[PDB]
Amino acid sequence: RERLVYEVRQKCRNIEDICISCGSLNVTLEHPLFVGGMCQNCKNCFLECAYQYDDDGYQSYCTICCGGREVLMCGNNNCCRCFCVECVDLLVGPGAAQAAIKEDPWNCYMCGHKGTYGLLRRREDWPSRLQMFFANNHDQEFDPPKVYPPVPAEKRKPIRVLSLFDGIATGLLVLKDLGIQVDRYIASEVCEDSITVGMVRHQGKIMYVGDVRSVTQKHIQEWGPFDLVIGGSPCNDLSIVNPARKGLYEGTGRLFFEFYRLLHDARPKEGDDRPFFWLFENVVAMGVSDKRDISRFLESNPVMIDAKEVSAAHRARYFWGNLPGMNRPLASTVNDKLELQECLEHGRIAKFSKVRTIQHFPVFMNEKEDILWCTEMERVFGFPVHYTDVSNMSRLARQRLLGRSWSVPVIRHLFAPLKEYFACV
Amino acid sequence: RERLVYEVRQKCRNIEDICISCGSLNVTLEHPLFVGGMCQNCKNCFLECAYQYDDDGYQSYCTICCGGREVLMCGNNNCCRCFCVECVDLLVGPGAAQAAIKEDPWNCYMCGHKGTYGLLRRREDWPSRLQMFFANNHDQEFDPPKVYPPVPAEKRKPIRVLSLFDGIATGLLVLKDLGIQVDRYIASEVCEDSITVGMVRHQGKIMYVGDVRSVTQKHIQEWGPFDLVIGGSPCNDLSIVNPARKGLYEGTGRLFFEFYRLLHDARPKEGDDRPFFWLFENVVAMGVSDKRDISRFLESNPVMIDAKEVSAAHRARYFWGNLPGMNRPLASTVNDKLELQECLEHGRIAKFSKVRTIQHFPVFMNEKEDILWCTEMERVFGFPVHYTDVSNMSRLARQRLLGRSWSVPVIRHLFAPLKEYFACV
Ligand SMILES: Nc1ncnc2c1ncn2[C@@H]1O[C@H](CSCC[C@H](N)C(=O)O)[C@@H](O)[C@H]1O
Ligand SMILES: Nc1ncnc2c1ncn2[C@@H]1O[C@H](CSCC[C@H](N)C(=O)O)[C@@H](O)[C@H]1O
Ligand SMILES: [Zn+2]
Ligand SMILES: [Zn+2]
Ligand SMILES: [Zn+2]
Ligand SMILES: [Zn+2]
Ligand SMILES: [Zn+2]
Ligand SMILES: [Zn+2]
């Protein structure tokens, strides 16, 4: 693309007529953040790569092209973006990257105070375009989810939940917080610590099953009709945060199908018009063909929901499902804490306003750099105070346990219209 | 196990009380071919490894322990077994392997003419035990397939077939050979050569679809009710014959679920008691957890069927399904050719009686070593004479095309009782 952008700056080619990521001429889209066109292969790359972060908490690849060999990290607080040397040679000029390295307090171009440069200019409604960009994923066209008519209030009954990959029983907790009567809560999980957390916090009510692969269709039938089936595949191997990324499709992908199977096992037959609901959860840093196969099998379009809208964590997650109002915008109640500082312990001050979890140690306390405490990690994700202090487990394990979990106010947002279909306390 | 077999030969321990594969004390089974016990981990290893062959046409690992670091290949004609140096040190004695290397015309212990040795003796009903060994896979317990009562002859109608991973239309060909009227034959396939083969040989009757992943439930509904859904996942990546074995679960495993999905899409509802039948096919050289997940999802027990019983090829394949009489023993009609020589062209003589396809070049013609000709490969698998000579394709591709296919008399054996449920020509 060096010669093509030579012709762009000579006013012989429009920058909007060229794909600013790789220099392709097959322009179909516009680049959502900056000025230029966008080809489809770069859209797939952008889907996979944009929200991939390294162990330093900064982006794994360049923000522009979603590739790049050596990148520029950003000095500005809470910003995690990177711009590779090659991109800066076109849009800011030749040698601007090598000169920009030497600028010790440097701000990236999404954070630049001027907001206007010569060849590169920032497009104004970029957050709106970022939200629209996932609606722009009409390549995987699917039929709209079947809307079930509301059951009258006197006729409502307690909800029954099959919860696969339950973890620390975030789903049941949220259902309690919403005041929905829970007839029963069947849960499959294999990690003993998470089992214990659920046992204690939910007071023996949870009927514990073993591995998901031991659950047969006969099991599904004899454990009574289910009203709500929920689950989230393992995300630790999909996430770029784990240093030992042996594979992505291995382990986690197989377990996905387990959800798939039991979903069909729990689904009412056609002609049985009783209300039935399901939710699957996954990370945004995933493969495109992976995401397609998931969308193909669950026969639906993903919704991306980021917890930043309602909580103090960057937690962007896909939610497939047929719960009513899964698309509607997220509202943050006053109880929710949109600033990191409100979630800290007294005596601590946060330089950060959000913690990126999908400047390693986020806290300045007594002029020293510390990790968030376990009870604060609970407060960040919306869990009740001292939620995971049940058994005698190490801090590393307990942090890990909290880290995998669903963001509580997001899950409250999703589960809230179920109150219109089931009984209240 | 060296010290344990020291105590075995001192008449202080029974060889039947020790696992002769790895020396484990957790004896649950008996070794099917030879004298000793067998632990469960070695059973899983034996399931994965026994029918794995290298590119030389001989076994990938030792026959005894299904491991081994350096193996002894067998001199006897058509025998492909290998025995590693370590195994021969216990059962035949120390240094017997190094001395046995020096014996230039050497026979392995499954082929030895005496049939009786000191520590190792061959158990007599080993083929019967080999057949029973797959019935011995009761670890994956499942309910018996639902038997549908026979429809009266006057009421019978033409069969409708959804055929995924169709290849060269072996299924429709076999249905024609059985004289079953075929209302329609919907087929998904992506390889153009195989499409062409089916087009020509089946005279435009086949309605060709694209990739299986583009077939929706709506497609399944609007293409009319299906009476028979069949398919076999890609086996080239699972097979050890391809040198570039990057993975086994990638590509082929994902495509398996496609079958799974469309099967549920094509299945009649409960309460609709109309006859419906399905068949899935796969190779025997596969992983145990892979085989378990397949058995879990199709909710059935595999049947292993080897084509040697009815054809001139070693073609051991798993068949899941609910077709009546899928367990019953295979009969070879006089038309079928149990000897390789009958399948050769005139002027050729086969040293081999069977061709192992899952001394590379199987034929001595004019005192020279040659590959089987394409028309003979067709004759080996039971295809009609000159079946794949349709378009202008290379020999390597055309052999490959034939190689993937289902064995015709095996498929005839499976499909034969469908004549009791549908209309005849
Ligand atoms: N085979 C298996 N069966 C059930 N759970 C499993 C499993 N393998 C891994 N898991 C669990 O699946 C979870 C995935 S992340 C769980 C998030 C959950 N929604 C929460 O709020 O905590 C992990 O806790 C892991 O322990
Ligand atoms: N995505 C896909 N959709 C349909 N077929 C595919 C496919 N990917 C690979 N295949 C085909 O699946 C076949 C698997 S082996 C086919 C055997 C078949 N029963 C026969 O008699 O020939 C291959 O021919 C391969 O071309
Ligand atoms: Zn591009
Ligand atoms: Zn870049
Ligand atoms: Zn910045
Ligand atoms: Zn053993
Ligand atoms: Zn061995
Ligand atoms: Zn032999």
Curated annotation (Swiss-Prot), chains A, B:
Consequence when changing residue 74 to R: In TBRS; somatic mutation
Subcellular location: Nucleus; Chromosome; Cytoplasm
Superkingdom of the source species: Eukaryota
GO BP annotation list: autosome genomic imprinting; cellular response to amino acid stimulus; cellular response to bisphenol A; cellular response to ethanol; cellular response to hypoxia; DNA methylation-dependent constitutive heterochromatin formation; hepatocyte apoptotic process; methylation
PTM statement from Swiss-Prot or TrEMBL: Sumoylated; sumoylation disrupts the ability to interact with histone deacetylases (HDAC1 and HDAC2) and repress transcription. Auto-methylated at Cys-235: auto-methylation takes place in absence of DNA substrate and inactivates the DNA methyltransferase activity. Inactivation by auto-methylation may be used to inactivate unused DNA methyltransferases in the cell.
Zinc finger (PHD-type): 59-115
Free-text domain note: The PWWP domain is essential for targeting to pericentric heterochromatin. It specifically recognizes and binds trimethylated 'Lys-36' of histone H3 (H3K36me3).
Protein name: DNA (cytosine-5)-methyltransferase 3A
Range covered out of full length: 476 to 912 of 912
